[PDB]
Symmetry: D2
Subunit: 116 residues, 4 copies
């Protein structure tokens, strides 16, 4: 998978499981076209999101449904969601890992970019 996501829960000290994640690609008319979606695994990852066939050059938006997640745990959080927007594969295909550490009133995101 050239597009990976690792979502962690800083309150409980575990991976954030069942977190909805929607990915969009910027269309020629500057709109956001759905590209891929999934739910985080027990390890806090997205399995089978895309492949080198679909993951082409372009600007991508990765939307993490942190609100539903916290609310499912009986917690009312600050953010409506957590968004990560970046240009991908603009210099040859790459492997991208998006780390997201979650707290009800805080989130961090770190991108790791390597050669497949």
């Amino acid at each position: 998978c050239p597009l990976m996501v690792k979502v962690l829960d800083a309150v409980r000290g575990s991976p954030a499981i069942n977190v909805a994640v929607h990915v969009f690609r910027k269309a020629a008319d500057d709109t956001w076209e759905p590209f891929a979606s999934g739910k985080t695994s027990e390890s806090g990852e997205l399995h089978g999101l895309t492949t080198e066939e679909e993951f082409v050059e372009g600007i991508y938006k990765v939307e993490i449904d942190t609100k539903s997640y916290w609310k499912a745990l009986g917690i009312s959080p600050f953010h409506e969601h957590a968004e990560v927007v970046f240009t991908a594969n603009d210099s040859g295909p790459r492997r991208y890992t998006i780390y997201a550490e979650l707290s009800p009133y805080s989130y961090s995101t770190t991108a790791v970019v390597t050669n497949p």
Copy 2:
């Protein structure tokens, strides 16, 4: 100012100065209506953004132009921008401070919510 922003540069160890910040409020038709904009000061803050008169209940989006910022320093970064979306004043007027710590391939955002 009931809406404050503190933007830090983790590379240089200083406040992120001259960082463009655009704020939007969700309109009745789910579109993003411009609400306020500015550039961070020498202390990394936005002065005179809004007041208790305009800062009413609603969903707000705070967009930080982290890309221009890094690029101005001769650095090509990961993110297209950093976004913070949250419901404000939904339980009585509040004072919100949005902390944003910036690195070229990472950013964190923490919200501090207090009583004015």
Copy 3:
């Protein structure tokens, strides 16, 4: 005015109040000697740990008792504490603001240095 510590509670969305902060300086014998102490205010910060004249060049260790802070809320957190170790005023005086964002299993620390 030269050393400021700001502690945020990433879980509740507020300043971390009444949090113990201990500062140490590295002694010639490579031991850590007490230098300053406080408890964060209602605004989660300490600003009077030291002064421009007292804060001399050296290696300082700022230690935040995050364990007690979480334990009170009935939480069993990961860290025994959060600590920042840094050389101060190595290349001349500077003002230092250390931001600490805390969660039970995560903490970040960011320094803004000026002068």
Copy 4:
């Protein structure tokens, strides 16, 4: 398999490679005795610092030499190092993954604990 350390370079967008990591355990005399050591791989991680049998209940200090890492790139960073101090296996065995995201004037540390 029980203790994993993952080190990321928030500036370059990559794993922090060849980063020194030293582990210590708190001794009965309240001193820190060496327990394990390594250098992160091309993937910025260490996984073989210890084993299920060796990793007994106690207070561990994981120390990452971030200073040397930044200094090589010609950078004068804030921290002398990044260290995580925590009680392991207090309430029975657990697997521990410690994530460390590094920048010259900022580092976060997050632990994922399971079992």
